[PDB]
């Protein structure tokens, strides 16, 4: 799958190596091999969540066909909130997690 | 709903507080509460809209299952152009609005 | 159609004019007019693709309805891999391609 973290924390305030810890974190949370787990982090963005530009993070999780059941997604979101709140020092109320399906994806070679 | 604005204008040239005003414009145009409208703005990007790398903006709108009809999507667009032309100092022919659905989302 | 390229490469290592050349190649490869092709490059990101922090690039392709058949998507991918390895000086194993459908899109008059 694919994890995209957008945050309005600057880069110098986003921990180093987050991209790989996050990567390992997802694999064990989702029941994916970490060789299938692809992570993009984009910091220093301008964001408003609930009409507030206080520090916040948005995590998009994309997969082929179906990303998960409504029940499996809530349960997985819980573990994602536990992890990012510790990693970023944000309140859980400042973390969003969206899901969308993809049509396909190919790695080269 | 989620609104992602991608632009090749640097941050110095994007008005302070766009994300906030953008957020209240979206609630009233889409008719959704302001607590459910989430806004990301990503500037300093390299962009080519219709072969041209002149200043441009892409606004992606997303929501659960469906976003809108053909008609509601074009109506909603006309409103976003009037807001974004003024706020970014851009022509309407340099603004692109894409709609794509979500499986779900949750805030904490 | 829309093309989104995320890379951990800093902008000084992304060739100048890449966003123009990529629009022209998209048109020929996907078989679409160049007025209708839309490119975004976001460099200087923190990525981990197939569990590695080494230089990489994921490209996201997205048209309305269905981007393509598996067959045409496979063939198109192979052409994109040919293009981005020579432009970005990465190997195919560090380039990923995603396909997801859109509902609607509109350019201002």
mmCIF file of C-alpha atoms in Angstrom:
data_model
loop_
_atom_site.group_PDB
_atom_site.id
_atom_site.type_symbol
_atom_site.label_atom_id
_atom_site.label_comp_id
_atom_site.label_asym_id
_atom_site.label_seq_id
_atom_site.Cartn_x
_atom_site.Cartn_y
_atom_site.Cartn_z
ATOM 1 C CA UNK A 1 0.000 0.000 0.000
ATOM 2 C CA UNK A 2 0.841 3.789 -0.006
ATOM 3 C CA UNK A 3 1.019 6.152 2.987
ATOM 4 C CA UNK A 4 1.085 9.933 2.319
ATOM 5 C CA UNK A 5 1.637 12.204 5.345
ATOM 6 C CA UNK A 6 0.961 15.946 4.790
ATOM 7 C CA UNK A 7 1.764 18.144 7.855
ATOM 8 C CA UNK A 8 2.113 21.912 8.613
ATOM 9 C CA UNK A 9 4.983 21.166 11.070
ATOM 10 C CA UNK A 10 8.117 22.462 9.402
ATOM 11 C CA UNK A 11 10.676 19.802 8.247
ATOM 12 C CA UNK A 12 13.168 20.734 11.113
ATOM 13 C CA UNK A 13 10.402 19.818 13.647
ATOM 14 C CA UNK A 14 9.397 16.533 11.919
ATOM 15 C CA UNK A 15 11.564 13.743 13.397
ATOM 16 C CA UNK A 16 14.349 12.283 11.197
ATOM 17 C CA UNK A 17 13.703 8.753 9.747
ATOM 18 C CA UNK A 18 9.892 9.080 10.352
ATOM 19 C CA UNK A 19 9.395 7.817 6.730
ATOM 20 C CA UNK A 20 11.006 4.362 7.661
ATOM 21 C CA UNK A 21 9.600 3.939 11.238
ATOM 22 C CA UNK A 22 6.159 4.870 9.725
ATOM 23 C CA UNK A 23 6.956 2.298 6.956
ATOM 24 C CA UNK A 24 7.692 -0.510 9.503
ATOM 25 C CA UNK A 25 4.707 0.669 11.701
ATOM 26 C CA UNK A 26 2.189 0.241 8.811
ATOM 27 C CA UNK A 27 3.433 -3.225 7.712
ATOM 28 C CA UNK A 28 2.651 -4.730 11.187
ATOM 29 C CA UNK A 29 -0.555 -2.645 11.565
ATOM 30 C CA UNK A 30 -2.007 -3.507 8.069
ATOM 31 C CA UNK A 31 -0.694 -7.109 7.697
ATOM 32 C CA UNK A 32 1.402 -6.071 4.656
ATOM 33 C CA UNK A 33 5.013 -6.970 3.846
ATOM 34 C CA UNK A 34 7.128 -3.746 4.344
ATOM 35 C CA UNK A 35 8.501 -4.282 0.734
ATOM 36 C CA UNK A 36 4.901 -3.440 -0.426
ATOM 37 C CA UNK A 37 4.664 -0.392 1.998
ATOM 38 C CA UNK A 38 5.467 2.943 0.263
ATOM 39 C CA UNK A 39 5.617 6.205 2.236
ATOM 40 C CA UNK A 40 5.731 9.885 1.147
ATOM 41 C CA UNK A 41 6.034 12.711 3.778
ATOM 42 C CA UNK A 42 5.451 16.384 2.631
ATOM 43 C CA UNK A 43 6.195 18.950 5.405
ATOM 44 C CA UNK A 44 6.014 22.785 5.814
ATOM 45 C CA UNK A 45 2.555 22.840 4.108
ATOM 46 C CA UNK A 46 -0.250 25.306 5.003
ATOM 47 C CA UNK A 47 -3.220 23.366 6.495
ATOM 48 C CA UNK A 48 -6.572 23.988 8.260
ATOM 49 C CA UNK A 49 -8.317 21.039 10.013
ATOM 50 C CA UNK A 50 -11.647 21.878 11.761
ATOM 51 C CA UNK A 51 -11.110 25.595 10.839
ATOM 52 C CA UNK A 52 -7.797 25.689 12.756
ATOM 53 C CA UNK A 53 -4.227 26.249 11.407
ATOM 54 C CA UNK A 54 -2.712 24.910 14.706
ATOM 55 C CA UNK A 55 -0.194 22.077 13.959
ATOM 56 C CA UNK A 56 -1.852 19.026 12.284
ATOM 57 C CA UNK A 57 -1.078 15.931 10.137
ATOM 58 C CA UNK A 58 -3.175 14.167 7.442
ATOM 59 C CA UNK A 59 -2.409 10.503 6.535
ATOM 60 C CA UNK A 60 -3.779 9.110 3.205
ATOM 61 C CA UNK A 61 -3.712 5.260 2.843
ATOM 62 C CA UNK A 62 -4.216 4.010 -0.754
ATOM 63 C CA UNK A 63 -4.488 0.361 -1.986
ATOM 64 C CA UNK A 64 -5.731 -1.676 -5.001
ATOM 65 C CA UNK A 65 -9.478 -2.354 -5.354
ATOM 66 C CA UNK A 66 -10.547 -2.241 -1.651
ATOM 67 C CA UNK A 67 -8.408 -0.646 1.160
ATOM 68 C CA UNK A 68 -10.376 -2.460 3.942
ATOM 69 C CA UNK A 69 -13.722 -2.953 5.751
ATOM 70 C CA UNK A 70 -15.182 -0.004 7.754
ATOM 71 C CA UNK A 71 -14.428 -2.080 10.918
ATOM 72 C CA UNK A 72 -10.810 -3.021 9.837
ATOM 73 C CA UNK A 73 -10.134 0.692 8.875
ATOM 74 C CA UNK A 74 -11.333 2.121 12.260
ATOM 75 C CA UNK A 75 -9.314 -0.536 14.158
ATOM 76 C CA UNK A 76 -6.197 0.315 11.973
ATOM 77 C CA UNK A 77 -6.755 4.122 12.371
ATOM 78 C CA UNK A 78 -6.562 3.652 16.240
ATOM 79 C CA UNK A 79 -2.994 2.172 15.969
ATOM 80 C CA UNK A 80 -2.039 4.950 13.477
ATOM 81 C CA UNK A 81 -3.251 7.649 15.986
ATOM 82 C CA UNK A 82 -1.230 5.985 18.859
ATOM 83 C CA UNK A 83 1.966 6.071 16.624
ATOM 84 C CA UNK A 84 1.829 9.565 15.001
ATOM 85 C CA UNK A 85 0.793 11.371 18.232
ATOM 86 C CA UNK A 86 3.970 9.915 19.890
ATOM 87 C CA UNK A 87 6.106 10.568 16.730
ATOM 88 C CA UNK A 88 4.928 14.191 16.059
ATOM 89 C CA UNK A 89 3.873 15.382 19.596
ATOM 90 C CA UNK A 90 0.394 16.366 18.251
ATOM 91 C CA UNK A 91 -2.969 15.816 19.981
ATOM 92 C CA UNK A 92 -4.999 12.941 18.465
ATOM 93 C CA UNK A 93 -7.637 15.612 17.548
ATOM 94 C CA UNK A 94 -5.003 17.094 15.119
ATOM 95 C CA UNK A 95 -4.500 13.796 13.154
ATOM 96 C CA UNK A 96 -6.755 12.822 10.162
ATOM 97 C CA UNK A 97 -6.650 9.453 8.301
ATOM 98 C CA UNK A 98 -8.305 9.099 4.832
ATOM 99 C CA UNK A 99 -8.583 5.991 2.603
ATOM 100 C CA UNK A 100 -9.136 5.709 -1.223
ATOM 101 C CA UNK A 101 -8.852 2.812 -3.659
ATOM 102 C CA UNK A 102 -6.451 2.722 -6.641
ATOM 103 C CA UNK A 103 -6.977 0.880 -10.007
ATOM 104 C CA UNK A 104 -3.398 -0.632 -10.065
ATOM 105 C CA UNK A 105 0.313 0.025 -9.266
ATOM 106 C CA UNK A 106 3.642 -1.315 -10.792
ATOM 107 C CA UNK A 107 7.260 -1.235 -9.475
ATOM 108 C CA UNK A 108 9.986 -1.320 -12.235
ATOM 109 C CA UNK A 109 12.503 -4.212 -12.721
ATOM 110 C CA UNK B 1 -14.560 17.156 2.356
ATOM 111 C CA UNK B 2 -10.822 17.587 1.534
ATOM 112 C CA UNK B 3 -9.454 20.331 -0.709
ATOM 113 C CA UNK B 4 -5.752 20.073 -1.841
ATOM 114 C CA UNK B 5 -4.351 23.174 -3.650
ATOM 115 C CA UNK B 6 -1.098 22.521 -5.661
ATOM 116 C CA UNK B 7 0.524 25.721 -7.194
ATOM 117 C CA UNK B 8 3.983 26.718 -8.625
ATOM 118 C CA UNK B 9 3.747 30.151 -6.868
ATOM 119 C CA UNK B 10 6.337 30.266 -4.022
ATOM 120 C CA UNK B 11 5.030 30.616 -0.447
ATOM 121 C CA UNK B 12 6.088 34.349 -0.357
ATOM 122 C CA UNK B 13 3.412 34.954 -3.085
ATOM 123 C CA UNK B 14 0.495 33.091 -1.434
ATOM 124 C CA UNK B 15 -1.589 35.287 0.897
ATOM 125 C CA UNK B 16 -1.309 34.480 4.640
ATOM 126 C CA UNK B 17 -4.522 32.834 5.789
ATOM 127 C CA UNK B 18 -5.543 31.293 2.415
ATOM 128 C CA UNK B 19 -6.004 27.823 4.074
ATOM 129 C CA UNK B 20 -8.503 29.433 6.592
ATOM 130 C CA UNK B 21 -10.570 31.650 4.165
ATOM 131 C CA UNK B 22 -10.410 28.809 1.582
ATOM 132 C CA UNK B 23 -11.907 26.635 4.372
ATOM 133 C CA UNK B 24 -14.945 28.977 4.985
ATOM 134 C CA UNK B 25 -15.451 29.555 1.189
ATOM 135 C CA UNK B 26 -15.644 25.729 0.705
ATOM 136 C CA UNK B 27 -18.182 25.151 3.537
ATOM 137 C CA UNK B 28 -20.634 27.740 2.070
ATOM 138 C CA UNK B 29 -20.126 26.806 -1.680
ATOM 139 C CA UNK B 30 -20.380 22.992 -1.053
ATOM 140 C CA UNK B 31 -22.896 23.492 1.823
ATOM 141 C CA UNK B 32 -21.065 21.407 4.453
ATOM 142 C CA UNK B 33 -20.235 22.402 8.069
ATOM 143 C CA UNK B 34 -16.853 24.200 8.478
ATOM 144 C CA UNK B 35 -15.625 21.584 11.029
ATOM 145 C CA UNK B 36 -15.730 18.868 8.202
ATOM 146 C CA UNK B 37 -13.773 20.938 5.571
ATOM 147 C CA UNK B 38 -10.015 20.189 5.616
ATOM 148 C CA UNK B 39 -7.529 22.211 3.512
ATOM 149 C CA UNK B 40 -3.915 21.523 2.448
ATOM 150 C CA UNK B 41 -1.941 24.095 0.333
ATOM 151 C CA UNK B 42 1.316 22.943 -1.296
ATOM 152 C CA UNK B 43 3.350 25.770 -2.956
ATOM 153 C CA UNK B 44 6.804 25.960 -4.620
ATOM 154 C CA UNK B 45 5.954 23.019 -6.952
ATOM 155 C CA UNK B 46 7.015 22.620 -10.652
ATOM 156 C CA UNK B 47 3.822 22.550 -12.784
ATOM 157 C CA UNK B 48 2.816 22.448 -16.493
ATOM 158 C CA UNK B 49 -0.957 23.055 -17.042
ATOM 159 C CA UNK B 50 -1.741 22.750 -20.811
ATOM 160 C CA UNK B 51 1.987 22.677 -21.889
ATOM 161 C CA UNK B 52 2.608 26.062 -20.056
ATOM 162 C CA UNK B 53 4.655 26.415 -16.814
ATOM 163 C CA UNK B 54 3.229 29.896 -16.225
ATOM 164 C CA UNK B 55 1.714 30.397 -12.716
ATOM 165 C CA UNK B 56 -1.156 27.908 -12.227
ATOM 166 C CA UNK B 57 -3.189 26.119 -9.493
ATOM 167 C CA UNK B 58 -4.773 22.634 -9.252
ATOM 168 C CA UNK B 59 -7.531 22.185 -6.637
ATOM 169 C CA UNK B 60 -8.457 18.554 -5.886
ATOM 170 C CA UNK B 61 -11.790 17.980 -4.071
ATOM 171 C CA UNK B 62 -12.509 14.620 -2.305
ATOM 172 C CA UNK B 63 -15.349 13.175 -0.129
ATOM 173 C CA UNK B 64 -16.938 9.747 0.686
ATOM 174 C CA UNK B 65 -18.398 7.513 -2.133
ATOM 175 C CA UNK B 66 -19.338 10.391 -4.549
ATOM 176 C CA UNK B 67 -18.357 14.155 -4.575
ATOM 177 C CA UNK B 68 -21.118 15.585 -6.857
ATOM 178 C CA UNK B 69 -23.125 15.382 -10.114
ATOM 179 C CA UNK B 70 -21.734 16.740 -13.445
ATOM 180 C CA UNK B 71 -23.954 19.833 -12.833
ATOM 181 C CA UNK B 72 -23.093 20.387 -9.140
ATOM 182 C CA UNK B 73 -19.323 19.910 -9.894
ATOM 183 C CA UNK B 74 -19.402 22.595 -12.725
ATOM 184 C CA UNK B 75 -21.610 24.968 -10.541
ATOM 185 C CA UNK B 76 -19.247 24.479 -7.525
ATOM 186 C CA UNK B 77 -16.236 25.077 -9.858
ATOM 187 C CA UNK B 78 -17.557 28.475 -11.069
ATOM 188 C CA UNK B 79 -17.630 29.668 -7.381
ATOM 189 C CA UNK B 80 -14.081 28.349 -6.621
ATOM 190 C CA UNK B 81 -12.679 30.207 -9.730
ATOM 191 C CA UNK B 82 -14.119 33.576 -8.529
ATOM 192 C CA UNK B 83 -12.399 33.034 -5.065
ATOM 193 C CA UNK B 84 -9.049 31.631 -6.381
ATOM 194 C CA UNK B 85 -8.551 34.160 -9.307
ATOM 195 C CA UNK B 86 -8.687 37.036 -6.717
ATOM 196 C CA UNK B 87 -6.709 35.290 -3.912
ATOM 197 C CA UNK B 88 -3.751 34.047 -6.048
ATOM 198 C CA UNK B 89 -3.700 36.851 -8.723
ATOM 199 C CA UNK B 90 -4.313 34.215 -11.495
ATOM 200 C CA UNK B 91 -6.452 33.963 -14.683
ATOM 201 C CA UNK B 92 -9.345 31.453 -14.707
ATOM 202 C CA UNK B 93 -7.631 29.640 -17.629
ATOM 203 C CA UNK B 94 -4.734 28.917 -15.155
ATOM 204 C CA UNK B 95 -7.011 27.130 -12.598
ATOM 205 C CA UNK B 96 -7.924 23.401 -12.638
ATOM 206 C CA UNK B 97 -10.406 21.693 -10.246
ATOM 207 C CA UNK B 98 -10.498 17.826 -10.000
ATOM 208 C CA UNK B 99 -13.080 15.793 -7.975
ATOM 209 C CA UNK B 100 -12.229 12.235 -6.736
ATOM 210 C CA UNK B 101 -14.033 10.018 -4.147
ATOM 211 C CA UNK B 102 -12.808 8.489 -0.793
ATOM 212 C CA UNK B 103 -13.599 5.065 0.810
ATOM 213 C CA UNK B 104 -13.690 6.726 4.318
ATOM 214 C CA UNK B 105 -11.941 9.167 6.719
ATOM 215 C CA UNK B 106 -11.725 9.755 10.503
ATOM 216 C CA UNK B 107 -10.323 12.616 12.661
ATOM 217 C CA UNK B 108 -9.300 11.800 16.294
ATOM 218 C CA UNK C 1 -5.190 13.343 -17.614
ATOM 219 C CA UNK C 2 -3.103 14.338 -14.507
ATOM 220 C CA UNK C 3 0.460 13.285 -13.624
ATOM 221 C CA UNK C 4 1.822 13.729 -10.053
ATOM 222 C CA UNK C 5 5.530 12.881 -9.456
ATOM 223 C CA UNK C 6 6.797 12.815 -5.829
ATOM 224 C CA UNK C 7 10.594 12.418 -5.336
ATOM 225 C CA UNK C 8 13.040 12.575 -2.375
ATOM 226 C CA UNK C 9 15.520 14.119 -4.808
ATOM 227 C CA UNK C 10 16.180 17.813 -4.080
ATOM 228 C CA UNK C 11 15.190 20.304 -6.837
ATOM 229 C CA UNK C 12 18.854 20.950 -7.880
ATOM 230 C CA UNK C 13 19.070 17.251 -8.997
ATOM 231 C CA UNK C 14 15.723 17.378 -10.915
ATOM 232 C CA UNK C 15 16.536 18.510 -14.495
ATOM 233 C CA UNK C 16 15.147 21.978 -15.477
ATOM 234 C CA UNK C 17 12.109 21.748 -17.851
ATOM 235 C CA UNK C 18 11.255 18.170 -16.631
ATOM 236 C CA UNK C 19 7.564 19.224 -16.133
ATOM 237 C CA UNK C 20 7.374 20.348 -19.861
ATOM 238 C CA UNK C 21 9.155 17.257 -21.389
ATOM 239 C CA UNK C 22 6.977 14.918 -19.167
ATOM 240 C CA UNK C 23 3.699 16.517 -20.449
ATOM 241 C CA UNK C 24 4.837 15.930 -24.119
ATOM 242 C CA UNK C 25 5.729 12.229 -23.432
ATOM 243 C CA UNK C 26 2.487 11.623 -21.458
ATOM 244 C CA UNK C 27 0.529 12.825 -24.536
ATOM 245 C CA UNK C 28 2.355 10.478 -26.983
ATOM 246 C CA UNK C 29 2.399 7.477 -24.532
ATOM 247 C CA UNK C 30 -1.231 7.660 -23.176
ATOM 248 C CA UNK C 31 -2.520 8.885 -26.604
ATOM 249 C CA UNK C 32 -4.153 12.173 -25.403
ATOM 250 C CA UNK C 33 -3.922 15.808 -26.663
ATOM 251 C CA UNK C 34 -1.328 17.997 -24.842
ATOM 252 C CA UNK C 35 -3.976 20.663 -23.895
ATOM 253 C CA UNK C 36 -5.568 17.849 -21.737
ATOM 254 C CA UNK C 37 -2.293 16.699 -19.948
ATOM 255 C CA UNK C 38 -1.529 18.228 -16.488
ATOM 256 C CA UNK C 39 1.819 17.686 -14.607
ATOM 257 C CA UNK C 40 2.788 18.374 -10.913
ATOM 258 C CA UNK C 41 6.415 17.692 -9.620
ATOM 259 C CA UNK C 42 6.937 17.784 -5.753
ATOM 260 C CA UNK C 43 10.662 17.280 -4.912
ATOM 261 C CA UNK C 44 12.636 17.403 -1.610
ATOM 262 C CA UNK C 45 10.178 15.067 0.086
ATOM 263 C CA UNK C 46 10.972 12.272 2.605
ATOM 264 C CA UNK C 47 10.132 8.931 0.918
ATOM 265 C CA UNK C 48 10.732 5.194 1.541
ATOM 266 C CA UNK C 49 9.796 3.086 -1.589
ATOM 267 C CA UNK C 50 9.986 -0.754 -1.303
ATOM 268 C CA UNK C 51 11.351 -0.169 2.283
ATOM 269 C CA UNK C 52 14.412 2.020 1.332
ATOM 270 C CA UNK C 53 15.382 5.734 1.825
ATOM 271 C CA UNK C 54 17.654 5.750 -1.365
ATOM 272 C CA UNK C 55 16.606 8.164 -4.186
ATOM 273 C CA UNK C 56 13.152 7.340 -5.697
ATOM 274 C CA UNK C 57 10.119 8.741 -7.560
ATOM 275 C CA UNK C 58 6.463 7.618 -7.585
ATOM 276 C CA UNK C 59 4.322 8.919 -10.462
ATOM 277 C CA UNK C 60 0.508 9.150 -10.037
ATOM 278 C CA UNK C 61 -1.631 9.044 -13.208
ATOM 279 C CA UNK C 62 -5.378 9.918 -12.968
ATOM 280 C CA UNK C 63 -8.067 10.434 -15.751
ATOM 281 C CA UNK C 64 -11.908 10.327 -15.380
ATOM 282 C CA UNK C 65 -13.809 6.987 -15.252
ATOM 283 C CA UNK C 66 -11.105 4.316 -15.836
ATOM 284 C CA UNK C 67 -7.485 5.317 -16.718
ATOM 285 C CA UNK C 68 -7.072 2.155 -18.859
ATOM 286 C CA UNK C 69 -7.215 -1.691 -19.195
ATOM 287 C CA UNK C 70 -4.500 -3.698 -17.272
ATOM 288 C CA UNK C 71 -2.907 -4.394 -20.709
ATOM 289 C CA UNK C 72 -2.666 -0.765 -21.949
ATOM 290 C CA UNK C 73 -1.674 0.361 -18.378
ATOM 291 C CA UNK C 74 1.201 -2.249 -18.375
ATOM 292 C CA UNK C 75 2.398 -1.001 -21.831
ATOM 293 C CA UNK C 76 2.144 2.696 -20.804
ATOM 294 C CA UNK C 77 4.089 1.967 -17.550
ATOM 295 C CA UNK C 78 6.970 0.396 -19.520
ATOM 296 C CA UNK C 79 7.249 3.676 -21.538
ATOM 297 C CA UNK C 80 7.144 5.865 -18.394
ATOM 298 C CA UNK C 81 9.971 3.730 -16.804
ATOM 299 C CA UNK C 82 12.050 4.297 -20.033
ATOM 300 C CA UNK C 83 11.504 8.112 -19.675
ATOM 301 C CA UNK C 84 12.087 8.806 -15.875
ATOM 302 C CA UNK C 85 15.263 6.599 -15.441
ATOM 303 C CA UNK C 86 17.078 8.652 -18.233
ATOM 304 C CA UNK C 87 15.644 12.027 -16.941
ATOM 305 C CA UNK C 88 16.162 11.352 -13.149
ATOM 306 C CA UNK C 89 19.249 9.004 -13.363
ATOM 307 C CA UNK C 90 17.568 6.389 -11.098
ATOM 308 C CA UNK C 91 17.049 2.656 -11.780
ATOM 309 C CA UNK C 92 13.616 1.205 -12.625
ATOM 310 C CA UNK C 93 13.473 -0.525 -9.204
ATOM 311 C CA UNK C 94 13.220 2.976 -7.538
ATOM 312 C CA UNK C 95 10.347 4.178 -9.837
ATOM 313 C CA UNK C 96 6.739 3.310 -8.998
ATOM 314 C CA UNK C 97 3.536 4.145 -11.009
ATOM 315 C CA UNK C 98 -0.028 4.446 -9.621
ATOM 316 C CA UNK C 99 -3.388 4.589 -11.479
ATOM 317 C CA UNK C 100 -6.615 5.893 -9.833
ATOM 318 C CA UNK C 101 -9.816 7.159 -11.504
ATOM 319 C CA UNK C 102 -11.308 10.656 -11.133
ATOM 320 C CA UNK C 103 -15.032 11.673 -11.108
ATOM 321 C CA UNK C 104 -14.788 15.038 -12.955
ATOM 322 C CA UNK C 105 -12.338 17.805 -13.894
ATOM 323 C CA UNK C 106 -12.674 21.317 -15.392
ATOM 324 C CA UNK C 107 -10.269 24.054 -16.592
ATOM 325 C CA UNK C 108 -11.324 27.746 -16.283
ATOM 326 C CA UNK C 109 -12.447 29.543 -19.530
#
